[PDB]
Amino acid sequence: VKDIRFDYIRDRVCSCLKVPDSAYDKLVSGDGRTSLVQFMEEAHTKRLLIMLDGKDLSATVKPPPKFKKKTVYFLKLQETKLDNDNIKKLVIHGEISENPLETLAAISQDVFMPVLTAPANQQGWPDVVAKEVTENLHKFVSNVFVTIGQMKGQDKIHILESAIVTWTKQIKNVLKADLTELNFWSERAANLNSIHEQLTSEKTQKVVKVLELAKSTYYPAFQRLFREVEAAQQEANDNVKFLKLVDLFKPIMHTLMLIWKHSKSSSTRFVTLMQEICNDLIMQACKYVPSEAVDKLRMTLRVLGTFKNYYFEYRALSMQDTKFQNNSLFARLDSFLERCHDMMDLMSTCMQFNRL
Amino acid sequence: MALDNRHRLIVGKLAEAFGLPENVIEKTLTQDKQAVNSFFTPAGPPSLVFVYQVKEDKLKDGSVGPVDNKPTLHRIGPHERIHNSVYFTRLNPKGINEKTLEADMGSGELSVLWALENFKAIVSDLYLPIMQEQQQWGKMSTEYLEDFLSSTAKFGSMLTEAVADDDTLQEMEECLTEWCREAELLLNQTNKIKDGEERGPDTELEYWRTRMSNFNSITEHLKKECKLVLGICSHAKAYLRWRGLDVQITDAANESKDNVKYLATLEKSMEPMYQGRVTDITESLPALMTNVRMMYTIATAEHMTRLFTKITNQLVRRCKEQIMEDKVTLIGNMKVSVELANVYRQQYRLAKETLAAQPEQAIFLKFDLSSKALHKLIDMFTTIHQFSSLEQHTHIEGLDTMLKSLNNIID
What does the H/E/C string look like for B226-265?
A: HHHHHHHHCCCCCHHHHHHHHHHHHHHHHHHHHHHHHHHH
Given a contact cutoff of 8 angstroms between Cβ atoms, the answer to whether B317 and B367 are in contact is no
**Cβ burial A107-141 (10 Å sphere, 16+ → b, else e):** bbebbbbbbeeebbeeebbebebbbebbebbbbbe
- The Cα-based distances of A320 to A314, A315, A317 in angstroms read 10, 9, 5
Angle between helices B361-386 and B327-357 (to 10 degrees): 150
Within 13 Å of residue A161, how many CA atoms lie on the same side as its CB? 14
**H or E element that contains B209:** helix B202-222
User: Which 8-state DSSP code applies to residue B384?
Assistant: H
User: Which 8-state DSSP code applies to residue B52?
Assistant: B
Residue A150: closest CA among chain B residues belongs to which residue? B141
**H or E element that contains B50:** strand B49-51
Test B129 with A62 for CB contact under 8 angstroms: yes
- Paired strand residues for A93: A74
- Paired strand residues for B49: B74
Distance between CA B4 and CA B37 in Å, rounded?
Answer: 9
Which experimental approach was used here?
A: cryo-EM
Test A127 with B60 for CB contact under 8 angstroms: no
Who's near A143: CB < 8 A, 6+ residues apart? Answer: B144, B148
B80 reaches A (C-beta below 8 A): yes
For residue A46, give the nearest of B213, B122, B232, B77 by alpha carbon: B122
Residues in B 362-401 with any Cβ partner in A closer than 8 A: none
CA distance B409 to chain A (A): 56
Q: How many residues does chain A have?
A: 356
Who's near B38: CB < 8 A, 6+ residues apart? Answer: B44, B45
- Which ranges constitute the DSSP H helices of chain A? 2-16, 23-27, 33-40, 100-106, 113-121, 128-146, 155-176, 180-199, 202-211, 218-243, 251-264, 268-288, 293-321, 324-352
What Rg, from alpha-carbon coordinates, does chain B have?
33
User: Which 8-state DSSP code applies to residue A253?
Assistant: H
- Paired strand residues for A92: A75
- The Cα-based distances of A138 to A165, A187, A280, B78, B143 in angstroms read 9, 29, 47, 18, 19
What are the φ and ψ backbone dihedral angles of A21, each rounded to 5 degrees?
-170, 165
Widest Cα–Cα separation across chain A: 102
Distance between CA A190 and CA A196 in Å, rounded?
Answer: 10
Test B49 with A111 for CB contact under 8 angstroms: yes
Given a contact cutoff of 8 angstroms between Cβ atoms, the answer to whether A105 and A144 are in contact is yes
User: Which 8-state DSSP code applies to residue A290?
Assistant: -
Distance between CA A229 and CA A232 in Å, rounded?
Answer: 6
3-state secondary structure of A58: strand
A153 reaches B (C-beta below 8 A): no
Distance between CA A322 and CA A317 in Å, rounded?
Answer: 8
Given a contact cutoff of 8 angstroms between Cβ atoms, the answer to whether A325 and A275 are in contact is yes
Residue B256: closest CA among chain A residues belongs to which residue? A128
**Cβ burial A246-273 (10 Å sphere, 16+ → b, else e):** beeeeeebeeeeeebeeeeeeeeeeeee
A276 Rama sector, left if φ>0, alpha if ψ -120 to 50, beta otherwise: alpha
Test A88 with B63 for CB contact under 8 angstroms: yes
Distance between CA B66 and CA B57 in Å, rounded?
Answer: 11
Given a contact cutoff of 8 angstroms between Cβ atoms, the answer to whether B102 and A16 are in contact is yes
What are the φ and ψ backbone dihedral angles of B350, each rounded to 5 degrees?
-60, -40
B327 Rama sector, left if φ>0, alpha if ψ -120 to 50, beta otherwise: alpha
Residue A12: closest CA among chain B residues belongs to which residue? B16
